[PDB]
Amino acid sequence: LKDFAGRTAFVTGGANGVGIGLVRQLLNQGCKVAIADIRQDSIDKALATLEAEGSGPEVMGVQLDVASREGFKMAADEVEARFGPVSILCNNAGVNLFQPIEESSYDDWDWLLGVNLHGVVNGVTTFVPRMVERVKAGEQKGGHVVNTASMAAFLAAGSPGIYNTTKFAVRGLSESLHYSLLKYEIGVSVLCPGLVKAGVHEFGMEPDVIGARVIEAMKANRLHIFSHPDHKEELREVFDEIIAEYQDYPKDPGYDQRVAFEKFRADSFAEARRQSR
Amino acid sequence: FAGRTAFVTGGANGVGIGLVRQLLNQGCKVAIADIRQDSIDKALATLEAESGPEVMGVQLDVASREGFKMAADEVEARFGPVSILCNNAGVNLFQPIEESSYDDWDWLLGVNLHGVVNGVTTFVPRMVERVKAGEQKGGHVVNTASMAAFLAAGSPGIYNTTKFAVRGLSESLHYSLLKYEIGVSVLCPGLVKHEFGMEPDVIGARVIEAMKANRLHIFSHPDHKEELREVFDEIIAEYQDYPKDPGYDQRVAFEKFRADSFAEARRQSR
Known part of the structure; x- marks a missing residue:
C-alpha cells in the first residue's frame, strides 16, 4: 500500500477506543476518514475533538449499526457520495460479554454475532466487491481491510465464550480474505490486541500507539498485527x-x-x- | 460408555455414521439426526443389517432452534437423557469470500456455526442441570471442525470462517465445562472417504479414545x-x-x- 494521500477510509466503532486511534492516524497519513458508529452522541464528540485538532474538512460521521446489511449499504453510499470511493476499511466495531457459553442465551449469541461477526461480514460484503470492481476497471490501485479481532482469536479460556467464538471467526475470515485478495493487491490484516487503555484500566496500550503500529503493518500487508508483544x-x-x-x-x-x-x-x-x- | 445415549448430527453418513457405529459398538444408544429423511433410513437399514433397538433416527435442520429443541425432546423421551453430543453436520462451498453473497453466508453459517450453537444451547444446559442435581455423571460434546480451523487459504473462505468459529467455541466450552466433568473435543479431520480418504470407522474409533482422554483437539490424521x-x-x-x-x-x-x-x-x- 503506497501513499495514503487522497484515499478515503471508513472506520466502524470509529468514535473512541481503538477506533479513534485508527481514525487519527489515518488522518495523519492524509486520508479522508468516515467515522461509523452506533451512537450519534459518541460520533459528535469524536468529530468535535478532531475538529479541535484541526482535521475538520477531512472527517465525517455516519450513524450505523454494523449488524444491519441494509444500514451498511446506505452508510457506504453516503460516504462514497461525499468523500468518494473508499479504499481503506477498518471493521473495528465490537462488543463483549463476560460469560461462559453454557450460561449464555440465544439472545446473547445473536447480539454478539451481529456486531462482532456479521459486522465484519457486512463491511466486507458491502465494500470489497466494490473495491474489486474498481481494481479490475483500472479505477483503483491498492487498498486495505483491517478487521479488529483480539488475542482471544488465539487464546480462548472459559469466558468470554461467545466473544472468543466471534474473534476466532474474524481471524478465519481475515486470513481467508488476505489470500484471496492478493491477486487484486488489496491488503488484509487482522488486528489482535491485548489490553487497550487493581489499576487494570490504567496500563492498557494507548489507541494512538496501536494506530501507528497498524499503519506500519498495513504498509507491509502483515496478516497478523500483534500490536502487543506481551x-x-x-x-x-x-x-x-x-x-x-x-x-x-x-x-x-x-x-x-x-x-x-x-x-x-x-x-x-x-x-x-x-x-x- | 455403556448405557449412555448419544445424539449425532449429520449422523447419516461420512464421519457421522463412523461415529454412530463406533458409539453403538461401545454399548451406547444413539440418535442419528440429519436433514434428509431417506439418508436416515438408508443409515438405519445398514445398521439393522448389523441390533437396532439401540439406534434411532430424527429428521432435523440443525439451523432451526425450534427444530433442535423438538428433536432433543423426542430423543430423550425414547432413549433417555443425552450425555454425548456430536455436532457433526456441515456444508461446504468452494468460493473465495469476495465472490460470495449474503445468501452463501446465511447458508453456511446456518449449518456449520448455528448448528453447533443450537446443539450446545439445546443440550449443554440440560447436562449441566443434571450434573448439578447428581442425576448425571460425566458427558462429552464433540464438535466437527476441520483442518480448515487451522489452515485457511483463499478458498473456501466462508467455510474456513465457520470452522475457526467452531474451534473457538469448542476451546471455550472445554475450559468452562471442566468443573462439571463434561468433556469437550474439536474433531479436526483431513480427507474422509476420494478413494484415499480416511475410513469413517477409523475416525470414529480414534474419536472414542480421545473422548476418554478429554483431548481438546482430535487430529485424526497424522497428515x-x-x-x-x-x-x-x-x-x-x-x-x-x-x-x-x-x-x-x-x-x-x-x-x-x-x-x-x-x-x-x-x-x-x-
Whole structure:
C-alpha cells in the first residue's frame, strides 16, 4: 500500500477506543476518514475533538449499526457520495460479554454475532466487491481491510465464550480474505490486541500507539498485527501444546496416496504464504 | 460408555455414521439426526443389517432452534437423557469470500456455526442441570471442525470462517465445562472417504479414545503435523520486537499472571 494521500477510509466503532486511534492516524497519513458508529452522541464528540485538532474538512460521521446489511449499504453510499470511493476499511466495531457459553442465551449469541461477526461480514460484503470492481476497471490501485479481532482469536479460556467464538471467526475470515485478495493487491490484516487503555484500566496500550503500529503493518500487508508483544511466549507454548496433541497413529489404508495429494495442496498454500511475506 | 445415549448430527453418513457405529459398538444408544429423511433410513437399514433397538433416527435442520429443541425432546423421551453430543453436520462451498453473497453466508453459517450453537444451547444446559442435581455423571460434546480451523487459504473462505468459529467455541466450552466433568473435543479431520480418504470407522474409533482422554483437539490424521508446525512458526515470526510503550511493565506483569492461571487450567485439562 503506497501513499495514503487522497484515499478515503471508513472506520466502524470509529468514535473512541481503538477506533479513534485508527481514525487519527489515518488522518495523519492524509486520508479522508468516515467515522461509523452506533451512537450519534459518541460520533459528535469524536468529530468535535478532531475538529479541535484541526482535521475538520477531512472527517465525517455516519450513524450505523454494523449488524444491519441494509444500514451498511446506505452508510457506504453516503460516504462514497461525499468523500468518494473508499479504499481503506477498518471493521473495528465490537462488543463483549463476560460469560461462559453454557450460561449464555440465544439472545446473547445473536447480539454478539451481529456486531462482532456479521459486522465484519457486512463491511466486507458491502465494500470489497466494490473495491474489486474498481481494481479490475483500472479505477483503483491498492487498498486495505483491517478487521479488529483480539488475542482471544488465539487464546480462548472459559469466558468470554461467545466473544472468543466471534474473534476466532474474524481471524478465519481475515486470513481467508488476505489470500484471496492478493491477486487484486488489496491488503488484509487482522488486528489482535491485548489490553487497550487493581489499576487494570490504567496500563492498557494507548489507541494512538496501536494506530501507528497498524499503519506500519498495513504498509507491509502483515496478516497478523500483534500490536502487543506481551503474549509471544504464551502463544509459543500454546502452539507447542497443540502440536503435542498429535498422536503417534498408524498409517491407515490409503495413507501414502493421501499424503502425496496433501503435500500437493500444502505446496500451493505455502506458495501463497511465501508471496504474502 | 455403556448405557449412555448419544445424539449425532449429520449422523447419516461420512464421519457421522463412523461415529454412530463406533458409539453403538461401545454399548451406547444413539440418535442419528440429519436433514434428509431417506439418508436416515438408508443409515438405519445398514445398521439393522448389523441390533437396532439401540439406534434411532430424527429428521432435523440443525439451523432451526425450534427444530433442535423438538428433536432433543423426542430423543430423550425414547432413549433417555443425552450425555454425548456430536455436532457433526456441515456444508461446504468452494468460493473465495469476495465472490460470495449474503445468501452463501446465511447458508453456511446456518449449518456449520448455528448448528453447533443450537446443539450446545439445546443440550449443554440440560447436562449441566443434571450434573448439578447428581442425576448425571460425566458427558462429552464433540464438535466437527476441520483442518480448515487451522489452515485457511483463499478458498473456501466462508467455510474456513465457520470452522475457526467452531474451534473457538469448542476451546471455550472445554475450559468452562471442566468443573462439571463434561468433556469437550474439536474433531479436526483431513480427507474422509476420494478413494484415499480416511475410513469413517477409523475416525470414529480414534474419536472414542480421545473422548476418554478429554483431548481438546482430535487430529485424526497424522497428515498435517509438519505443515501445522510451520504455520505456527510463521505466526510467531510475525511478532514485532516493538519498543516498550507507556505502562508496558505493569501490563506485562498482569499478563504473566492471567497466563499462569490459564496455563494451570490447561495442565489440569491434560
